[PDB]
């Protein structure tokens, strides 16, 4: 059922790319702040969380318009397929 196959595969691909960007940013920031604590040999729990929050908020301010474009496109498309037979 090429229609069910398409809609089902695209749902998962969209989950993977919508979620990837915030987690990539968070991971890279995490690594750099973890390193800096080693070369400084200076340690605390809170600095990485503090920076990660800002990094993710900026990520959302920037990309969020595109999240809307992608979701609207998919939303229309699935309805048209569901009611396509008539």
């Amino acid at each position: 059922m090429d229609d069910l196959v398409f809609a089902g595969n695209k749902a998962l691909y969209l989950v993977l790319i919508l979620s990837g960007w915030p987690t990539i940013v968070a991971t890279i920031i995490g690594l750099l702040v973890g390193l800096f604590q080693t070369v400084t040999q200076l340690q605390e729990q809170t600095l990485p969380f503090g920076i990660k929050l800002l990094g993710v908020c900026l990520c959302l301010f920037l990309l969020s318009g595109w999240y809307g474009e992608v979701l609207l496109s998919y939303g229309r498309q699935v309805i048209f397929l569901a009611l396509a037979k008539g």
Partner: protein, 183 residues
């Protein structure tokens, strides 16, 4: 001597030589190994050789086969890609089979790719076939269309003689005598 072409493959060079010889142009093929083949002609023949290279659009591009668009090794494939690889293989197998029939020199086959739509929830359309073939001189072409139609009809689940097109041609005159060298 003037250089016409460089860095050719074996099977490009042989085609170029064949076409120049047919029009009375003596040409020479040279091998440079990692650099490929080079082709040379005399000055009196240079103009003509350039005119023919333009007119025939030499050297030829390689053969195109649909499976080249849908490699077997991508991470994932939709059904459409698999179905296209399948027909892209059946075409080549029928061509290789027809080349064994009596007195056929070469052939080409084309199949209607229904794959460009799903036909889901829908009646899938019947198949259509086209073939081209070249014969040795003195072959009764009219009597030989029947064989090919009969053979192709049963190669697929639903084909009508009406849906099979066949085009035949005889071989050209043989090029046996060598071209003359400029005085």
């Amino acid at each position: 001597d003037k250089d016409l072409l460089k860095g050719l493959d074996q099977e490009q060079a042989n085609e170029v030589i064949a076409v120049l010889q047919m029009h009375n142009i003596e040409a020479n093929k040279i091998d440079s190994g990692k650099l490929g083949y080079s082709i040379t002609v005399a000055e009196p023949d240079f103009t003509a050789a350039v005119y023919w290279i333009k007119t025939y659009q030499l050297p030829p591009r390689p053969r195109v086969e649909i499976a080249q668009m849908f490699p077997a090794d991508s991470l994932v494939s939709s059904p459409r890609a698999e179905k296209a690889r399948l027909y892209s293989a059946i075409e080549q197998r029928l061509e290789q089979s027809l080349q064994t029939m009596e007195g056929v020199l070469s052939a080409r086959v084309h199949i209607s790719y229904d794959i460009d739509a799903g036909e889901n929830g829908r009646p899938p359309k019947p198949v259509h076939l086209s073939a081209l073939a070249v014969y040795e001189r003195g072959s009764p072409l009219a009597h030989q269309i029947s064989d090919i139609k009969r053979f192709l009809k049963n190669s697929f689940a639903d084909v009508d003689y009406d849906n099979i097109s066949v085009v035949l041609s005889e071989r050209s005159d043989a090029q046996l005598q060598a071209p003359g060298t400029p005085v």
